[PDB]
Amino acid sequence: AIQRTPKIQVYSRHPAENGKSNFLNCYVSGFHPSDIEVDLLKNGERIEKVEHSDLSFSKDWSFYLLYYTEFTPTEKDEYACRVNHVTLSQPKIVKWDRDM
Amino acid sequence: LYKKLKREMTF
Amino acid sequence: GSHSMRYFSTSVSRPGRGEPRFIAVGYVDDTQFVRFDSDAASQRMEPRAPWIEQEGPEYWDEETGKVKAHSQTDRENLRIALRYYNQSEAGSHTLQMMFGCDVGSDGRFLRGYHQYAYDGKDYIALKEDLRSWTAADMAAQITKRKWEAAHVAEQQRAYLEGTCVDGLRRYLENGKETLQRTDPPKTHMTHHPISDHEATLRCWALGFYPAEITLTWQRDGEDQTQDTELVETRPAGDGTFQKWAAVVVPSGEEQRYTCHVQHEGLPKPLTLRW
């Protein structure tokens, strides 16, 4: 029952413009087993309406999921992505960079 | 178009 | 150019919570089209692509009948495997399954795939010659000996070549708008100091389809893969994809570096310099 730590990437769909409607994507990949919990945060608070893509895997049998939500960033607002998995001693939180 | 094995075969 | 269509099946047991969970998704190249979910209340194959919503209900009823047949096949496949390996039923185990076919630029058959994986490792799979099976462990040799005697390799070969290809052929017509397009990436560099003696050079590729791409860094025309950080290609969510690679460089030696991008939608590969 092999295990894989997920590769987390948080990012905007289009390069961010403050006050313009974008999509926030958190993309986890290369993990195993398949059960995973992903949340999206605004200043540390979980975002309610969030859809995820369908469960699929790559050629190496490693799963990848895409959690996405529509949002309009500001200068102030902090966003992040929180992922827990059986391979993680604690949930890992990834803050969204405009340049990543 | 999904696979259909006429007689479904298991391990 | 060449094209591909794949179905990915994932089954997971949940011992205290009852029946295993089955999830299957269709793909043409990097574009998803259908999906199916065991726990979904619809209990039907659902379109995830706009160009496949036009199919008649005769189509949907046929597909949703076969995917349910596979779902219960894998549910019993899981029971056989917990027996085969003698793992306790308290544990939760996974069975992944993939099948599909490839075609050339003109549409002729190229390759085919029929394979399973148990708990992330290869269990069984169909060889490229499509007359034989590769079986890792002695549990899979049993199923191999089962599937050889039942002539399974011949029936799937008929599917893969006959049915898998013809469906891919109509899909590539139905979706000519989206599928057969190729989106060139929009590229640029970003510069991010860390110390006063160092800086970070990042080379971006944005909004490209298909997702297959090659990113490269160089110094004076010589390849730098030593210091390179390169992220896995990520879906943009709109149907396109994004990727970037980065190197830490001594400041101010920057224009001494070049970034090189290759993609199908590019007539010639690109060279970016700071």
- CATH label of the domain that carries residue C140: 3.30.500.10
Is C60 in the same domain as C123? yes
Mutate to test the interface with A, among C93, C119, C201 (most CBs of A within 10 A): C119
User: Which residues partner with C257 through β-bridges?
Assistant: C219
DSSP letter (8 states) at residue B1: -
Burial of A96 (0-12, 13-18, 19+ CB in 10 A): buried
Is C169 in the same domain as C191? no
Helices C57-85 and C138-149: angle between axes, nearest 10 degrees: 130
Whether C158 contacts chain B with CB within 8 A? no
Domain range enclosing C24: 1-181
Closest Cα in chain A, distance from residue C264 (Å): 21
Return the closest-CA partner of residue C102 out of C236, C248, C1, C235. C1
A57, A31 contact by CB (below 8 A): no
Strand stretches in C82-145, DSSP E = 94-103, 109-118, 121-126, 133-135
Q: CA–CA separation, C234 vs C241, rounded Å?
A: 6
Residue type, A57: F
Give every CB contact of residue C156 below 8 A, 6+ residues apart in sequence: B3, B5, C99, C114, C126, C130
C135: left (phi over 0), alpha (psi -120 to 50) or beta: beta
Closest partner residue to C164 among B1, B5, B9, by Cβ? B1
Closest Cα in chain C, distance from residue A50 (Å): 13
Q: CA–CA separation, C133 vs C129, rounded Å?
A: 9
Domain range enclosing A50: 1-100
Is C161 in the same domain as C213? no
C137 phi, psi to nearest 5 deg: -100, 180
Count structural domains, chain C. Answer: 2
Is C175 in the same domain as C62? yes
C197: left (phi over 0), alpha (psi -120 to 50) or beta: alpha
Q: Radius of gyration over alpha carbons of chain C, in Å?
A: 23
Q: CA–CA separation, C70 vs C99, rounded Å?
A: 12
Question: Solving technique for this entry?
Answer: X-ray
A44, A81 contact by CB (below 8 A): no
> Which resolution in angstroms does this entry have?
3.3
Residue type, C82: L
Both tokens of A32, joined, read 């195993």
Is C112 in the same domain as C233? no
Q: CA–CA separation, C144 vs C158, rounded Å?
A: 18
H or E segment and range at residue C242: strand C241-250
Q: CA–CA separation, A8 vs A4, rounded Å?
A: 12
A23, C225 contact by CB (below 8 A): no
Give every CB contact of residue C148 below 8 A, 6+ residues apart in sequence: C133
C12 phi, psi to nearest 5 deg: -140, 125
Contact check, Cβ <8 Å, A1/C192? no
- Tell me, what CATH number does A38's domain have? 2.60.40.10
- Tell me, what CATH number does C219's domain have? 2.60.40.10
Place of tokens 């205290």: C16
Cα C79 to chain center, whole Å? Answer: 27
* Residue after which a domain boundary falls, among C181, C203, C228: C181
* Residue after which a domain boundary falls, among C154, C181, C208: C181
Count structural domains, chain A. Answer: 1
Q: Look at residue C147 and give its three-state secondary structure.
A: helix
C52, C36 contact by CB (below 8 A): no
Is C90 in the same domain as C142? yes
CA-CA distances (angstroms) from residue C56 to B1, C41, C52, C124? 13, 21, 10, 35
Q: CA–CA separation, C241 vs C212, rounded Å?
A: 9
Is C263 in the same domain as C134? no
Is C7 in the same domain as C118? yes
Cis previous bond, C57, omega within 30: no
CA-CA distances (angstroms) from residue C124 to A30, A31, C150, C157, C191? 21, 21, 15, 16, 48
* Residue after which a domain boundary falls, among C146, C181, C216: C181
User: Which residues partner with C158 through β-bridges?
Assistant: none
Is C159 in the same domain as C192? no
Residue type, C159: Y
Is C160 in the same domain as C209? no
Is C3 in the same domain as C110? yes
C17: left (phi over 0), alpha (psi -120 to 50) or beta: alpha
Is C30 in the same domain as C69? yes
**Any idea of the CA torsion for C169, C233, A36, B3, to the nearest 10 degrees?**
10
Whether C48 contacts chain A with CB within 8 A? yes
